Amino acid sequence: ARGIVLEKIAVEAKQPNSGMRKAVRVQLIKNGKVVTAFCPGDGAIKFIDEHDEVIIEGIGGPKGGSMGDIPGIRYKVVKVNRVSLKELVKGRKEKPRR
């Protein structure tokens, strides 16, 4: 699905793990609902800014739901402004429109 970023948040890991996971709130263009999506990669949250548009998909946990130590988050970000996020995190490409 395609959506618009509303704000950035951070979610605590489940016990007994420790840490904060970087996420965004997304408003879906097709029906106007608001969901939460995880941003994978080391330092990936720097490439997201408010009012960007993103492509999201499922996160791949049991029964099509959440996974790991982050319950409550069911999706992850795949593209940002029509550029692959994995590329941006590795390098090999630079975010357009500054």
């Binding site: 618009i4 509303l6 263009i29 106007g32």
Partner: protein, 69 residues
């Protein structure tokens, strides 16, 4: 999608979420969504006649902010 973007901007800035259409047309779904989510749209054909309307609406909202305060 323009109305969605306008609502996203309005979320944190009431006075900057608005659309100014100059000699364009508004779709049925767009106007329905704007009416549902209460987003203001100013359509027009004359540049000053369109800008002055936005200015005066902003002024009216500003005065109504403190009228009930």
């Amino acid at each position: 999608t323009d109305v969605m973007e306008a609502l996203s901007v309005k979320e944190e800035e009431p006075k900057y979420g608005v659309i100014l259409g100059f000699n364009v047309k508004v779709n049925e779904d767009a106007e329905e969504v704007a009416k549902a989510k209460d987003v203001k749209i100013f359509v027009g054909n004359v540049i000053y006649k369109l800008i002055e309307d936005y200015e005066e609406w902003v002024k009216e909202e500003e005065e109504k902010k403190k009228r009930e305060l």
